[PDB]
Amino acid sequence: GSKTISESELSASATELLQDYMLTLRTKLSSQEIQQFAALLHEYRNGASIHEFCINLRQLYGDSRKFLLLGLRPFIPEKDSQHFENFLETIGVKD
Amino acid sequence: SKTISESELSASATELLQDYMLTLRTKLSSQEIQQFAALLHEYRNGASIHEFCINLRQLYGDSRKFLLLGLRPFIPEKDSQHFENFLETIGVK
């Protein structure tokens, strides 16, 4: 929640992954869309539920770009990871 | 503060946040660290640098003002001048 800085916010390795993920997004998303992503990640880290985060990601990315959601795994803390895997399986995205 | 700033993208800044959180343990209670965590999250989500500074000063209090200096690597360049102005105003510079 908002009162807890999560593992990925404190991990240099996860941060390297975040920076590269953002560069990767440029290939499929517009600048305005990447702004929405940033807003969504910020909302999640600020306490939005994992469900709310996932639903908003899915509607932003759309069916044709949902594969990009796999790359968010490192930013999901332990408590929310099973929910996130469930989400990925539900929308037909898998490694 | 909508964009993910250079500070949030920087592996070294993240390492320093971990280091700073370990520092906080020696000076703040768990509840106070919860307050810090919420403030950083609100700043990152959209709170102004001025709002962040004002709330941190209130949280830390006079005797822990020196800790604010450790926030430097988490403040993106765009907010740096304001942050430094704040530090000088409260006399920690």
Delimit the domains of chain B by residue range: 1-93
**Which among A12, A18, A35 has CB closest to B15?**
A12
Residue B38 and residue A47: Cα distance in Å, rounded? 9
Which residue of chain A has the CA closest to B15? A12
Distance, CA of A88 to CA of B18 (rounded, Å): 29
Q: Please spell the DSSP secondary structure of A36-54, one letter per residue.
A: HHHHHHHHHHTT--HHHHH
Q: Tell me the C-alpha distance between B59 and B62, whole Å.
A: 9
- Write down the experimental method used for this entry: X-ray
Cα–Cα distances in angstroms (integers) from residue A95 to residues A68, A70, A89, A90, B26, in the given order:
11, 7, 10, 13, 42
Task: Report the candidate in A53, B18, B36 with the shortest Cα–Cα distance to residue B10.
Answer: B18
- The resolution, in angstroms to one decimal, equals 1.9
Q: For residue A53, give the nearest of A42, A68, A63 by alpha carbon.
A: A42
Measured between alpha carbons, how far is A25 from B68 in angstroms, rounded to an integer? 34
Q: Is B13 on the interface with A (CB under 8 A)?
A: yes
- C-alpha triplet A90, A2, A87: angle, nearest 5°: 5
Q: Which fold has domain A1-95?
A: Paired amphipathic helix 2 (pah2 repeat) (1.20.1160)
User: Nearest to residue B1, comparing CAs of B56, B58, B41?
Assistant: B41
Question: What does the alpha-carbon distance between residue B10 and residue A15 come to, in Å, rounded to a whole number?
Answer: 7
**Using CB atoms, which residue from B3, B17, B34 is nearest to A38?**
B3
Is 1.20.1160.20 the CATH classification of the domain at B1-93? yes
